[PDB]
Structure 1
Amino acid sequence: LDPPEAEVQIDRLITGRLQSLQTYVTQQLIRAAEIRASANLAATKMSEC
Structure 2
Amino acid sequence: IDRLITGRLQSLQTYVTQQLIRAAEIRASANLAATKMSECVLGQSKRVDF
TM-score, scaled to structure 1 = 0.81
Deviation at 1:32, TM superposition (A): 0.3
* Cα distance in 1, alignment partners of residues 35 and 12 from structure 2: 35
Q: What CA deviation, in whole Å up to 9, does each residue of 1:10-48 have, x standing for no partner?
A: 000000000000000000000000000000000000000
Runs of 4+ in structure 1 off by over 4 angstroms are: none
Q: Tell which structure's C-alpha radius of gyration is larger.
A: 1
RMSD: 0.2
* Cα distance in 2, alignment partners of residues 47 and 30 from structure 1: 26
Between the two structures, name the one with larger relative contact order (CA 8 Å, sep ≥ 6): 2
TM-score, scaled to structure 2 = 0.79
Q: What is the aligned counterpart of 1:22 among 10, 13, 21?
A: 13
Unaligned runs of 5+ in 2: 41-50
